[PDB]
Design an enzyme around this catalytic site. Structure first.
Site, mmCIF file in Angstrom:
data_model
loop_
_atom_site.group_PDB
_atom_site.id
_atom_site.type_symbol
_atom_site.label_atom_id
_atom_site.label_comp_id
_atom_site.label_asym_id
_atom_site.label_seq_id
_atom_site.Cartn_x
_atom_site.Cartn_y
_atom_site.Cartn_z
ATOM 1 N N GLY A 88 -10.245 7.982 9.249
ATOM 2 C CA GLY A 88 -10.623 7.777 10.654
ATOM 3 C C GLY A 88 -11.689 8.765 11.138
ATOM 4 O O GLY A 88 -12.204 8.673 12.245
ATOM 5 N N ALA A 110 -10.361 4.660 3.967
ATOM 6 C CA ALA A 110 -10.363 5.922 4.706
ATOM 7 C C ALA A 110 -11.683 6.700 4.595
ATOM 8 O O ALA A 110 -11.898 7.480 3.677
ATOM 9 C CB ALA A 110 -9.207 6.772 4.177
ATOM 10 N N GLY A 111 -12.598 6.569 5.575
ATOM 11 C CA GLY A 111 -13.789 7.414 5.556
ATOM 12 C C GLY A 111 -14.995 6.708 6.178
ATOM 13 O O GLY A 111 -15.942 7.333 6.638
ATOM 14 N N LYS A 127 0.832 -1.195 0.000
ATOM 15 C CA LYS A 127 0.000 0.000 0.000
ATOM 16 C C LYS A 127 0.873 1.255 0.000
ATOM 17 O O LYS A 127 1.600 1.538 0.943
ATOM 18 C CB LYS A 127 -0.868 -0.028 1.257
ATOM 19 C CG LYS A 127 -1.956 1.049 1.244
ATOM 20 C CD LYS A 127 -2.814 1.027 2.512
ATOM 21 C CE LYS A 127 -3.682 2.281 2.654
ATOM 22 N NZ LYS A 127 -4.384 2.249 3.937
ATOM 23 N N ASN A 164 -10.825 0.172 8.799
ATOM 24 C CA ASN A 164 -9.948 0.112 9.966
ATOM 25 C C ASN A 164 -10.645 0.625 11.225
ATOM 26 O O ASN A 164 -11.062 -0.146 12.079
ATOM 27 C CB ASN A 164 -8.725 0.967 9.660
ATOM 28 C CG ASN A 164 -7.609 0.734 10.661
ATOM 29 O OD1 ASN A 164 -6.512 1.259 10.518
ATOM 30 N ND2 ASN A 164 -7.926 -0.019 11.742
ATOM 31 N N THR A 165 -10.693 1.967 11.277
ATOM 32 C CA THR A 165 -11.203 2.657 12.456
ATOM 33 C C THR A 165 -12.589 2.151 12.877
ATOM 34 O O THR A 165 -12.848 1.853 14.035
ATOM 35 C CB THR A 165 -11.268 4.153 12.138
ATOM 36 O OG1 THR A 165 -9.986 4.592 11.684
ATOM 37 C CG2 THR A 165 -11.645 4.944 13.393
#
Lengths: 64, 233, 234, 64
Positions: free
Chosen positions: B149, B177-178, B88, B199-200
């Protein structure tokens, strides 16, 4: 003066192995960048560090 | 039979997970399994995880990198540490919003590709930059949904819809991401996009494992809705 | 497990289906199954196959077509002996242009219906205040619509359905019908802590109805677990 | 002149069963409303229709 992980240290004269040992870190779980070159913990050069030597000792961690 | 290929690698789940933010490692492994994920991203940083991530394919990243020189550097270290060909590419000059530098990601991708690297480039919702990356050779393209995040959800939907419009011409498109809720992933999937990277939203939840499954169901549901041909409002 | 109740009825699925627009009972049978649905609503129309293609689920009779309470209680009676079921989806739509329900009419019909021992499932606008009145009347549910019926716009009534979520504990089970066009819509509603969703146009009008019926299934399950899992805070 | 499903028909004198037979519908699927009195198709009253009766013949169909 040896740059270790960004911090200036008096490592000149010692080997990657000796330092990593003092650090108290296992060799198999890390990778050592010696001066732009990528080395596994177990495959670091034996040559003693010299003034100006840039060293990075990294591992896989969780993150992004 | 609904598999997609990252380069030579054939995955099934379109839900790619991330390792960060997990309080401990036990939960993380509960999460990874609950989601039925196969690819998990990991970061390379200056000095137990490998054991928690066993069973899954490690996707190394160049988080922390602010330039192309730093990203390639980190990629090299990740290659020796995971044993994998893909990476990545993440070049964020300023961590405040965690937005990627278009010119620096382009520079680093071109270097990694002729260096035998499988580039998975973290990027903003830039369709033109995406076509550049694809022409370079990157195995994929990953426009963010919103600042990393933030949990803001699909706020780049308008431009993301252009990625979907130009589906055929790009590598698989992975939105990362989002996303703070499963429905966000369903939305991105129903658009026809390939995969989702969460992730978050999972680790920062009261019950990470439970939320890892919800995201699993959601990404399955959205992909199917897309294949089932939705009604026209 | 994680079960809810419509009055005395305990359901497991949070996905209720409707039998409109299915181009045949065959793809309908498949959809209802793919959705793992327990309940399917049906209308009461003038006689110009279904009852057997709907075996395996429960029948919810609605009073669709009714423009007044009087016509509503009328369709309900016939709906009751036609299915033998105790519950009914109250529906009072004067102007079928948008299919918006009448506040007072649906309120009056709900009162008479419950005095007749009915279990009313009131189709209604996103009126929290009206919802609270319907609840004090003895309604087993409240069914705020997400958007104009069959439109498939989505959760255009989001801002108001949030209030329903906040007064979740004062209302009966909250089922969202009419307006959903994608499963991501249903997930959104379920992430708010609403009790269930009712889908009809979205599944049937789709190219592969059975497939979409499953999608919606996963989405209600996904959205529900997300809520119970405690989403992170943006 | 009985009202049948909203249409004026010359039904006075006939029975529900008779009309439903002519209609040709299966009784076990339809419900009959006679001036606000609700009956099962199989249980319709055997009373002859009156001038002014309002007859509805309904069955469970699509909708929801």
């Amino acid at each position: 003066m040896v740059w270790l992980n960004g911090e200036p240290r008096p490592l000149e004269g010692k080997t990657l192995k000796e330092v990593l040992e003092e650090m108290g870190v296992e060799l198999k779980g890390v990778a050592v960048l010696l001066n732009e070159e990528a080395f596994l913990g177990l495959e670091v050069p034996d040559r003693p560090l010299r003034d100006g030597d840039v060293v990075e000792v990294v591992a896989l961690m969780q993150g992004g | 039979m609904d598999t997609w290929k990252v380069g030579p690698v054939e995955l099934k789940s379109r839900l790619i997970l991330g390792s960060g933010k997990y309080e401990d490692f036990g939960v993380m492994r509960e999460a990874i399994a609950a989601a039925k994920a196969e690819v998990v991203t990991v970061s390379v940083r200056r000095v137990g995880l490998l054991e928690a991530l066993e069973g899954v394919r490690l996707l190394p990243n160049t988080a922390g990198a602010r330039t192309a020189e730093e990203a390639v550097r980190l990629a090299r270290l990740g290659r020796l540490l995971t044993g994998e060909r893909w990476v990545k590419l993440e070049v964020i000059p300023d961590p405040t919003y965690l937005l990627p530098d278009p010119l620096e990601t382009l520079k680093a991708a071109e270097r990694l590709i002729e260096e035998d690297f499988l580039v998975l480039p973290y990027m903003g919702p830039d369709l033109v930059l995406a076509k550049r990356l694809a022409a370079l050779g990157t195995a994929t393209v990953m426009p963010l949904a919103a600042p990393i995040g933030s949990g803001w959800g699909v706020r780049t939907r308008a431009l993301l819809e252009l990625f979907a419009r130009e589906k055929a011409s790009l590598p698989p498109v992975v939105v990362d991401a989002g996303l703070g809720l499963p429905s966000h992933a369903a939305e991105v999937m129903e658009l026809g996009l390939d995969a989702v990277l969460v992730n978050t939203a999972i680790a920062e939840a009261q019950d990470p494992p439970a939320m890892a499954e919800a995201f699993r169901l959601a990404v399955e549901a959205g992909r199917k809705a897309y294949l089932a041909g939705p009604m026209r409002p």
